Scaffold this active site. Structure first.
Site, PDB file in Angstrom:
ATOM      1  N   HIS A  78       0.839  -1.232   0.000  1.00 15.81           N
ATOM      2  CA  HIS A  78       0.000   0.000   0.000  1.00 15.81           C
ATOM      3  C   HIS A  78       0.865   1.270   0.000  1.00 15.81           C
ATOM      4  CE1 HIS A  78      -3.422  -2.573   1.872  1.00 15.81           C
ATOM      5  NE2 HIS A  78      -3.002  -3.020   0.691  1.00 15.81           N
ATOM      6  N   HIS A 237      -8.904  -2.137  -5.292  1.00 10.42           N
ATOM      7  CA  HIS A 237      -7.858  -2.472  -4.297  1.00 10.42           C
ATOM      8  C   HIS A 237      -6.794  -3.417  -4.891  1.00 10.42           C
ATOM      9  CE1 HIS A 237      -5.843  -2.449  -0.539  1.00 10.42           C
ATOM     10  NE2 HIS A 237      -5.579  -3.721  -0.805  1.00 10.42           N
ATOM     11  N   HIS A 264      -0.012 -11.573  -4.981  1.00  6.47           N
ATOM     12  CA  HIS A 264       1.386 -11.210  -4.636  1.00  6.47           C
ATOM     13  C   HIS A 264       2.354 -12.243  -5.233  1.00  6.47           C
ATOM     14  CE1 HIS A 264       0.442  -7.535  -2.770  1.00  6.47           C
ATOM     15  NE2 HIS A 264      -0.273  -8.081  -1.772  1.00  6.47           N
TER      16      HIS A 264
HETATM   17  C1  LIG Z   1      -9.965 -12.916  -0.095  1.00  5.72           C
HETATM   18  C2  LIG Z   1      -8.447 -12.867  -0.003  1.00  5.72           C
HETATM   19  C3  LIG Z   1      -7.861 -14.273  -0.025  1.00  5.72           C
HETATM   20  C4  LIG Z   1      -7.901 -12.032  -1.136  1.00  5.72           C
HETATM   21  O1  LIG Z   1      -7.765 -12.540  -2.234  1.00  5.72           O
HETATM   22  N1  LIG Z   1      -7.587 -10.747  -0.927  1.00  5.72           N
HETATM   23  C5  LIG Z   1      -7.012  -9.857  -1.935  1.00  5.72           C
HETATM   24  C6  LIG Z   1      -6.756  -8.547  -1.205  1.00  5.72           C
HETATM   25  N2  LIG Z   1      -5.374  -8.467  -0.779  1.00  5.72           N
HETATM   26  C7  LIG Z   1      -4.910  -7.387  -0.159  1.00  5.72           C
HETATM   27  O2  LIG Z   1      -5.607  -6.403   0.069  1.00  5.72           O
HETATM   28  C8  LIG Z   1      -3.474  -7.439   0.281  1.00  5.72           C
HETATM   29  C9  LIG Z   1      -3.323  -8.405   1.444  1.00  5.72           C
HETATM   30  C10 LIG Z   1      -3.438  -7.558   2.696  1.00  5.72           C
HETATM   31  O3  LIG Z   1      -2.444  -7.937   3.648  1.00  5.72           O
HETATM   32  C11 LIG Z   1      -3.232  -6.113   2.249  1.00  5.72           C
HETATM   33  N3  LIG Z   1      -3.069  -6.113   0.782  1.00  5.72           N
HETATM   34  C12 LIG Z   1      -7.661  -8.582   0.007  1.00  5.72           C
HETATM   35  C13 LIG Z   1      -7.802 -10.057   0.352  1.00  5.72           C
HETATM   36  C14 LIG Z   1      -6.790 -10.362   1.424  1.00  5.72           C
HETATM   37  O4  LIG Z   1      -5.784 -10.996   1.185  1.00  5.72           O
HETATM   38  N4  LIG Z   1      -7.092  -9.876   2.626  1.00  5.72           N
HETATM   39  C15 LIG Z   1      -6.272 -10.033   3.816  1.00  5.72           C
HETATM   40  C16 LIG Z   1      -7.098  -9.558   4.998  1.00  5.72           C
HETATM   41  C17 LIG Z   1      -7.531  -8.238   5.053  1.00  5.72           C
HETATM   42  C18 LIG Z   1      -8.294  -7.790   6.131  1.00  5.72           C
HETATM   43  C19 LIG Z   1      -8.635  -8.661   7.155  1.00  5.72           C
HETATM   44  C20 LIG Z   1      -9.353  -8.250   8.141  1.00  5.72           C
HETATM   45  C21 LIG Z   1     -10.022  -7.973   9.092  1.00  5.72           C
HETATM   46  C22 LIG Z   1     -10.798  -7.713  10.207  1.00  5.72           C
HETATM   47  C23 LIG Z   1     -11.555  -7.679  11.140  1.00  5.72           C
HETATM   48  C24 LIG Z   1     -12.244  -7.694  12.447  1.00  5.72           C
HETATM   49  C25 LIG Z   1     -13.695  -7.229  12.470  1.00  5.72           C
HETATM   50  C26 LIG Z   1     -13.373  -8.716  12.575  1.00  5.72           C
HETATM   51  C27 LIG Z   1      -8.206  -9.986   7.103  1.00  5.72           C
HETATM   52  C28 LIG Z   1      -7.441 -10.437   6.028  1.00  5.72           C
HETATM   53 ZN   LIG Z   2      -3.899  -4.601  -0.289  1.00  5.44          ZN
END
Ligand SMILES: CC(C)C(=O)N1C[C@H](NC(=O)[C@@H]2C[C@@H](O)CN2)C[C@@H]1C(=O)NCc1ccc(C#CC#CC2CC2)cc1
Ligand SMILES: [Zn+2]
EC number: 3.5.1.108
Length: 299
Positions: A78, A237, A264
């Site tokens: 970010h 995003h 990534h």
């Molecule tokens: C669906 C996934 C597999 C996927 O493909 N992603 C693609 C995007 N990657 C990103 O944004 C990368 C990975 C992150 O590091 C930052 N940049 C988002 C998602 C991801 O990797 N998100 C990790 C994540 C984010 C927030 C939270 C949260 C909480 C909260 C709470 C409390 C109330 C309960 C948890 C995990």
């Molecule tokens: Zn991100």
């Protein structure tokens, strides 16, 4: 001319690591010509600096992690996105802990802190990497491609089988010479599924996650009271994350990135494959900004 840029002034910020849950003090410092972006862990004696370069990327599933020995800097994507979007060549990034602070889950706060300090043109040509050949990597149904393009453009498509995503735009394409990174991309927040978050906490991941810094989705809907910032925030995003990973090349790109469910790991595969194939790119400078395929906001 097109000259390198650093920050005009030091910027300090405080926040929490999305993954670690740790309080972290961040300092952005001006840097000399041809420094690049260098991360520094000032909590360690002696300080460990890791240049934000593809070769220093740790084996990482969630975020982009830099490594040197058993020192890491987590979640650089970010901030690097923010620096890429404003065309910052040179800067020292100081951290009191292993993880960049997540702020509101987007690049918005970083772009603002940086544009509050203002930028400084430096007496030296900005070096660009111009994509000469198409370069693609696949693995299963994920694809990540570089295409020659007279400018800078990111297209991305995702396809989550989820009520929230199915009834929302999962494709987007942004030419940054004609569309504002700041306005159209920087405010796009990270996201997580309520079901994964339960499990990740169990494994001491996502310990700083809240509605304050992530889009929290359950079975059916966004739980964030105030909802989405863009109809297509999720794919926006993903473009923001890709622009962060692209900046590990160590120079601004002249070309197009196309992501199909890429992340990534595959982004990093594409950078490595691009670096290794010296026929596919060249370094170029521009004695005349007026004619170049890319332009910058005033310092
Ligand atoms: C669906 C996934 C597999 C996927 O493909 N992603 C693609 C995007 N990657 C990103 O944004 C990368 C990975 C992150 O590091 C930052 N940049 C988002 C998602 C991801 O990797 N998100 C990790 C994540 C984010 C927030 C939270 C949260 C909480 C909260 C709470 C409390 C109330 C309960 C948890 C995990
Ligand atoms: Zn991100």
């Amino acid at each position: 001319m097109i000259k390198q840029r650093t920050l005009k002034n030091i910027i300090r910020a405080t926040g929490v690591g999305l993954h670690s849950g740790e309080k972290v003090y961040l300092t952005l410092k001006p840097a000399p010509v041809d420094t690049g972006i260098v991360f520094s862990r000032t909590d360690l004696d002696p300080v460990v600096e890791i240049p934000a370069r593809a070769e220093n990327v740790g084996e990482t599933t969630m975020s982009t992690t830099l490594v040197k020995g058993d020192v890491k800097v987590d979640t650089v994507e970010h901030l690097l996105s923010a620096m890429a979007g404003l065309g910052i060549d040179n800067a020292y990034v100081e951290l009191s802990a292993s993880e960049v602070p997540i702020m509101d889950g987007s690049a918005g706060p970083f772009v603002f802190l940086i544009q509050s300090a203002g930028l400084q043109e430096q007496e030296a040509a900005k070096k660009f990497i111009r994509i000469k050949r198409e370069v693609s990597v696949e693995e299963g149904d994920k694809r990540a491609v570089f295409v020659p393009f007279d400018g800078f453009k990111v297209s991305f498509e995702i396809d989550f089988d989820h009520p929230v995503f199915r009834g929302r735009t999962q494709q987007a394409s942004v030419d940054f010479s004609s569309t504002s990174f700041v306005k159209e991309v920087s405010r796009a927040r990270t996201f997580g599924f309520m079901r994964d978050i339960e499990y990740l906490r169990s494994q001491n991941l996502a310990l700083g996650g809240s509605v304050e810094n992530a889009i929290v989705v359950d079975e059916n809907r966004v739980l964030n009271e105030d909802g989405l910032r863009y109809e297509d925030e999720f794919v926006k995003h993903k473009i923001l994350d890709a622009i962060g990973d692209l900046y590990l090349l160590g120079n601004s790109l002249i070309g197009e990135f196309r992501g199909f469910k890429s992340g990534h790991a595959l982004n990093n595969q594409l950078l490595r494959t691009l670096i290794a194939d010296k026929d596919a790119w060249e370094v170029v400078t521009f004695e005349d900004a007026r004619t170049a395929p890319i332009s910058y906001m005033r310092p």
